[PDB]
C-alpha cells in the first residue's frame, strides 16, 4: 500500500484510524499515528491487507504511537487533500495564530488556525496533556491523522475534539471548536524516527 498522511487503516479488524506521517527508523519503514488507536502489537491493515503492527504507544498522558511496516510498503512524503496531495517538507512548529489543516478518513481535509498550546484533554481513560488546539473541524475516525501547514510543515497527529451527536464538530462555528493534536516533535525524538520529506 502507498502510505500517505490522512488515509484509513484498521486496527485488529475493528477500529479505524488515520495515518499521520511516513517515517523511518534506520532501515525500518513506519508511520506515526495516535496512541489511543491501538495497543502494542495490534495489527494494522490498509484496504484489507496487513501492512504492519503497533511498535510502541503512550496513551493516556500523551497520545502517540508508530506502526512498523513490512518492507513491501511504499512510504511517501505526502498528506491526502481530496484527490490531490500536500508535500511534507519538514516539521517546524507553527505558532498560535498560524493557519493549519488536518487530514483524516472521516471529514477529509479541513483547515483552521492554531488557537492554544499545552491544553489538557480529560478523556475517559485519563488526561492527556501538552496538546495543541486548532479550530479546523474533525470527526470520529480522524484520530491519528496529519495536521500540516500549507507550506508542508508537519505539526502533529489528531487526538480528540468536542464532537456533537453527529460525530464531528464541523456543524458548530470555528469559534466553538476544540480539535486537539499531539505535537510531532516529541514523538520523533522519543522513538528515534525521521520524517520522510519530498
Amino acid at each position: 500500500a502507498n502510505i500517505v498522511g490522512g488515509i484509513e487503516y484498521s486496527i485488529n479488524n475493528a477500529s479505524l484510524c488515520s495515518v499521520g506521517f511516513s517515517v523511518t527508523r534506520g532501515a525500518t519503514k513506519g508511520f506515526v499515528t495516535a496512541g489511543h488507536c491501538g495497543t502494542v502489537n495490534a495489527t494494522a491493515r490498509i484496504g484489507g491487507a496487513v501492512v504492519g503492527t503497533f511498535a510502541a504507544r503512550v496513551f493516556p498522558g500523551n497520545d502517540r504511537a508508530w506502526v512498523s511496516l513490512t518492507s513491501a510498503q511504499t512510504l511517501l512524503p505526502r498528506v491526502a487533500n481530496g484527490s490531490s496531495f500536500v508535500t511534507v517538507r519538514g516539521s517546524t512548529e507553527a505558532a498560535v495564530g498560524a493557519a493549519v489543516c488536518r487530514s483524516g478518513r472521516t471529514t477529509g481535509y479541513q483547515c483552521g488556525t492554531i488557537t492554544a498550546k499545552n491544553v489538557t484533554a480529560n478523556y475517559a481513560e485519563g488526561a492527556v496533556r501538552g496538546l495543541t488546539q486548532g479550530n479546523a473541524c474533525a470527526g470520529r475516525g480522524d484520530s491519528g491523522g496529519s495536521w500540516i501547514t500549507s507550506a508542508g510543515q508537519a505539526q502533529g497527529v489528531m487526538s480528540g475534539a468536542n464532537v456533537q451527536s453527529n460525530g464531528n464538530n464541523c456543524g458548530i462555528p470555528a469559534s466553538q471548536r476544540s480539535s486537539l493534536f499531539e505535537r510531532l516533535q516529541p514523538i520523533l525524538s522519543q522513538y528515534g524516527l525521521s520524517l520522510v520529506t519530498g
Binding site: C17, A34, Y123, G141, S159, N162, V163, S179
Partner: peptide, 4 residues
C-alpha cells in the same frame, strides 16, 4: 473533547 473525546478521542477520535
Amino acid at each position: 473533547a473525546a478521542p477520535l
